[PDB]
Design a protein around this ligand. Structure first.
Ligand SMILES: Nc1nc2c(ncn2[C@@H]2O[C@H](COP(=O)(O)OP(=O)(O)NP(=O)(O)O)[C@@H](O)[C@H]2O)c(=O)[nH]1
Ligand SMILES: [Ca+2]
Ligand SMILES: [Mg+2]
Ligand SMILES: [Mg+2]
Ligand SMILES: [Mg+2]
Length: 160
């Protein structure tokens, strides 16, 4: 069937792994185990299309793995201002590995269940707008926005 290769990138501890594991395995990872490079594959129906999702969960080396990616979830945490500022460097890395200024991407503000917010929605909306991509908030803990974020990325890949 149709295969979509997604890559999740972003600063250490923003919740890349928890998001991917919530989507794929339907539980929340409470502990912190730094990732080297993990991949997940799951058959899912997205907008009536049966497809194979391959998701590369990267470390916050990353270059070669990222090269095959068709779309990128650029994740920061809403209680981590520095992770948000880092998004610029992640986007540049993506532009380099894909050798393109037109790569499917979705900006993700994770940990939206937490209250120590230092990145306001409008600030992230603005960044996403500058890149010409959607901004979506998520919580790997409550599941809020998780399916939306990943499926939106699939929908962005289909637009390119
Ligand atoms: N409350 C809350 N905690 C979260 C959320 N997502 C991740 N966390 C917590 O934040 C920590 C780091 O998450 P993790 O998924 O390991 O982050 P990472 O971005 O994959 N880290 P790395 O870059 O090292 O691989 C964990 O303790 C996890 O439970 C979220 O949406 N809400
Ligand atoms: Ca758990
Ligand atoms: Mg991880
Ligand atoms: Mg290059
Ligand atoms: Mg502020």
């Amino acid at each position: 069937m149709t295969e979509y290769k997604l890559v999740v990138v972003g600063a250490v501890g923003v919740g890349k792994s928890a998001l991917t594991i919530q989507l794929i395995q339907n539980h929340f990872v409470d502990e912190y185990d730094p990732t080297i490079e993990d991949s997940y594959r799951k058959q899912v129906v997205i907008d009536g299309e049966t497809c194979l999702l391959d998701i590369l969960d990267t470390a916050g080396m990353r270059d070669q793995y990222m090269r095959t990616g068709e779309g990128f979830l650029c994740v920061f945490a809403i209680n981590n201002t520095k992770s948000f500022e880092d998004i610029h460097q992640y986007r540049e890395q993506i532009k380099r590995v894909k050798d393109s200024d037109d790569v499917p991407m979705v900006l993700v503000g994770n940990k939206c269940d937490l209250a120590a917010r230092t990145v306001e929605s409008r600030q992230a909306q603005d960044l996403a707008r500058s890149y010409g991509i959607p901004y979506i908030e998520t919580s790997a803990k409550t599941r809020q926005g998780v399916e939306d974020a990943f499926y939106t990325l699939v929908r962005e890949i289909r637009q390119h």
